[PDB]
Amino acid sequence: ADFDAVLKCWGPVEADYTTIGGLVLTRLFKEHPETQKLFPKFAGIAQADIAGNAAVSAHGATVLKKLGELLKAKGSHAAILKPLANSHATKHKIPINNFKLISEVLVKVMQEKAGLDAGGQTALRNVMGIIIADLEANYKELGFSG
């Protein structure tokens, strides 16, 4: 049910993955500034320059596309999620808590741009909890617990 609740508000996200993707990464770097250094291509860019940055928005679109794939899969997602865990743990070297930060940013952005009301916000936190628990199990398989 919680996947359905998120998907009934995903339209504005999927309608402009670049714009919304930019909103999400811009807000992530503002509200959680320590996350920006985890993106060496973006680290060091002054906050005022991030909202208008096409590379940041293009990356945000990649992120939200991938999340849309997971959401549309409704909890049967191993072929999508395992590679995502593998690359984030081992290539990007992103400790798991950072996913919790981006999820909360997404909740905020969807409340403002996608009509995601209080119940939908609960649902999205639950769904992101499912995804993050699966990422974290995979991280642990690979030796990553930090």
Q: How far apart are CA 91 and CA 103, in angstroms?
A: 21
Q: Which of 13, 61, 85, 94 binds ligand HEM (CB under 6 A)?
A: 94
Q: Which of 98, 111, 122, 126 binds ligand HEM (CB under 6 A)?
A: 98
Tell me the per-residue interface mask from 65 to 84 with ligand HEM, x by CB under 6 A, - otherwise. -xx----------------x
Number of residues that bind ligand HEM (CB under 6 A): 16
Q: Which of 6, 102, 107, 116 binds ligand HEM (CB under 6 A)?
A: 102
List, as own/partner pairs, every contact residues 112-117 make where C-beta atoms lie below 8 angstroms and the sequence separation is at least 24, other chains included. Answer: 113/12, 113/13, 113/20, 113/23, 114/9, 114/10, 114/11, 114/12, 114/13, 114/20, 115/9, 115/12, 116/6, 116/9
Taking the least distance from each CB to ligand HEM, the nearer of 16 and 136 is 136
Tokens standing for 34? 């320590």
Judged by the rule CB under 6 A, the positions of this chain that interact with ligand HEM are 35, 38-39, 41, 62-63, 66-67, 84, 87-88, 92, 94, 98-99, 102
